[PDB]
Amino acid sequence: SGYTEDEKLNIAKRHLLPKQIERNALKKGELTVDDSAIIGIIRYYTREAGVRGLEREISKLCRKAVKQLLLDKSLKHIEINGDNLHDYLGVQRF
């Protein structure tokens, strides 16, 4: 059976998020995604036993953040949590 949310969170924290931050041309402390945002991604933007939808949205997350820093160099770091997640990912899906 499918991952629990704790499981998904650990996979996101150890792998998904480091991998996508890199890919999206972000440096180490330019982007903070707290645990309440990943959960939020899990609960409202995915519907799945594994983590590919989780990964897709984390990716979209990092892509938007890097475009934010590009479109405004007065930004040094982006903070995402459960409350502004939808500003990056749009209208919740589920």
UniProtKB/Swiss-Prot annotation:
Top-level taxonomic group: Bacteria
Subcellular location: Cytoplasm
Signal peptide stretch: none
Phenotype on disruption: When both lon and ycgE are disrupted levels of OmpF decrease, leading to lower drug susceptibility, with a greater effect at 26 degrees than at 37 degrees Celsius. The mechanism is not yet understood. Decreased persister cell formation upon antibiotic challenge due probably due to increased levels of MazF toxin.
Induction entry: By accumulation of abnormal proteins, such as at high temperatures. Under stress conditions.
Transmembrane segments: none
Subunit organization: Homohexamer. Organized in a ring with a central cavity. ATP binding and hydrolysis do not affect the oligomeric state of the enzyme.
Function: ATP-dependent serine protease that mediates the selective degradation of mutant and abnormal proteins as well as certain short-lived regulatory proteins, including some antitoxins. Required for cellular homeostasis and for survival from DNA damage and developmental changes induced by stress. Degrades polypeptides processively to yield small peptide fragments that are 5 to 10 amino acids long. Binds to DNA in a double-stranded, site-specific manner.
Family membership noted in the UniProt record: Belongs to the peptidase S16 family.
Other known facts: Both its proteolytic and protein-activated ATPase activities are stimulated by DNA, especially single-stranded DNA.
Protein name as catalogued: Lon protease
Organism: Escherichia coli (strain K12)
Gene of this entry: lon
Residues of the full protein shown: 491 to 584 of 784
